[PDB]
Design an enzyme around this catalytic site. Structure first.
Site, PDB file in Angstrom:
ATOM      1  N   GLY A  10      72.469   1.988  71.622  1.00  0.00           N
ATOM      2  CA  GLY A  10      72.787   1.133  70.480  1.00  0.00           C
ATOM      3  C   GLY A  10      71.748   1.257  69.377  1.00  0.00           C
ATOM      4  O   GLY A  10      72.006   0.879  68.231  1.00  0.00           O
ATOM      5  N   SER A  37      70.064   4.268  68.584  1.00  0.00           N
ATOM      6  CA  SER A  37      69.966   5.608  68.004  1.00  0.00           C
ATOM      7  C   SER A  37      70.425   5.646  66.546  1.00  0.00           C
ATOM      8  O   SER A  37      71.255   4.837  66.117  1.00  0.00           O
ATOM      9  CB  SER A  37      70.624   6.674  68.875  1.00  0.00           C
ATOM     10  OG  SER A  37      71.917   6.352  69.362  1.00  0.00           O
ATOM     11  N   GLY A  38      69.744   6.466  65.762  1.00  0.00           N
ATOM     12  CA  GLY A  38      69.971   6.530  64.330  1.00  0.00           C
ATOM     13  C   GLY A  38      69.007   5.605  63.617  1.00  0.00           C
ATOM     14  O   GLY A  38      68.761   5.785  62.422  1.00  0.00           O
ATOM     15  N   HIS A  63      74.707  12.358  66.188  1.00  0.00           N
ATOM     16  CA  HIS A  63      75.534  11.963  67.353  1.00  0.00           C
ATOM     17  C   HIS A  63      76.236  10.620  67.136  1.00  0.00           C
ATOM     18  O   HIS A  63      77.036  10.217  67.976  1.00  0.00           O
ATOM     19  CB  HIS A  63      74.752  11.993  68.690  1.00  0.00           C
ATOM     20  CG  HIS A  63      73.730  10.919  68.831  1.00  0.00           C
ATOM     21  ND1 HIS A  63      72.399  11.161  68.569  1.00  0.00           N
ATOM     22  CD2 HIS A  63      73.883   9.615  69.165  1.00  0.00           C
ATOM     23  CE1 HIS A  63      71.770  10.017  68.790  1.00  0.00           C
ATOM     24  NE2 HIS A  63      72.626   9.057  69.149  1.00  0.00           N
TER      25      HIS A  63
END
Ligand SMILES: N=C(N)c1ccc([C@@H]2Cc3ccccc3B(O)O2)cc1OCc1cccnc1
Length: 223
Positions: A174, A176-177, A41
């Site tokens: 901020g 995520s990942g 995403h």
């Protein structure tokens, strides 16, 4: 990251910051000199990857910057359900490894015992602002049964849940990942959760990295 605190400067050499349109979008994990692992995403235009960062507000002697030459999204990623939320980013040149830039090894064992984990990132803090200094929090893996109740019908075998029922420590917008690290290995990637972040009842949902061992190796080794 909400209800956490500042990281030490030497504890996160695998952490990547992902930018698009001049603002922080996502975190990511350096897993090989040429590859950063993040959430699918996080695919946005003209991504800029920053390695060796600690304070986003200052220019640091340890930092390296690269554009993305190839963004590889898992072929079965489903955006509506966040299922298989994983993406490999090939960097413009190999990362120059130092004490402050190192890859993180993946947890290949889906039956790994360690439930004691940590999360990190530059996502929103308890005040709703974006921090300049990277945040850290110790959290723990939550049972499949507990997470299924928190998010009825939305949890697949490609997801793990982790959180803190006591103080509401959680990843946020901020982050995520970003990595979920358990026993010095990459266990998951920050994927989604509840709004607002930091519920004592609803833990964060993470991509189950151990399910993607073969796909990651086959992508990295591709001609
Ligand atoms: N609580 C979490 N574990 C959580 C962690 C990271 C993210 C995001 C998801 C995201 C979407 C699109 C682009 C980037 C991101 B990301 O960096 O963090 C969202 C999260 O909860 C849902 C949410 C959506 C919206 C606002 N607040 C909260």
């Amino acid at each position: 990251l909400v209800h956490g605190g500042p990281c030490d400067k030497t504890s996160h050499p695998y952490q990547a910051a992902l930018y698009t349109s001049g603002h922080l979008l996502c975190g990511g994990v350096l897993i090989h000199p040429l590859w950063v692992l993040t959430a699918a995403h996080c695919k946005k235009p003209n991504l800029q990857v920053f390695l060796g960062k600690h304070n986003l507000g200052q220019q640091e002697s340890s930092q390296e910057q690269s554009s993305v030459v190839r963004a590889v999204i898992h072929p079965d990623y489903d955006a509506a359900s966040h299922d298989q939320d994983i993406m490999l980013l090939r960097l413009a040149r190999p990362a120059k490894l130092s004490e402050l830039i190192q890859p993180l090894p993946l947890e290949r064992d889906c039956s790994a015992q360690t439930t004691s984990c940590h999360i990190l990132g530059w996502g929103k803090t308890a005040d709703g602002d974006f921090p300049d200094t990277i945040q850290c929090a110790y959290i723990h893996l939550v049972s499949r049964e507990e997470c299924e109740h928190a998010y009825p019908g939305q949890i697949t075998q490609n997801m793990l849940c982790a959180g803190d029922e006591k103080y509401g420590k959680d990843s946020c917008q901020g982050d995520s990942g970003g990595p979920l690290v358990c026993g010095d290995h990459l266990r998951g990637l920050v994927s989604w959760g509840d709004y607002p972040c930091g519920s004592k009842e609803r833990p964060g949902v993470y991509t189950n990295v151990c399910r993607y061992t073969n796909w990651i190796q086959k992508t990295i080794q591709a001609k």
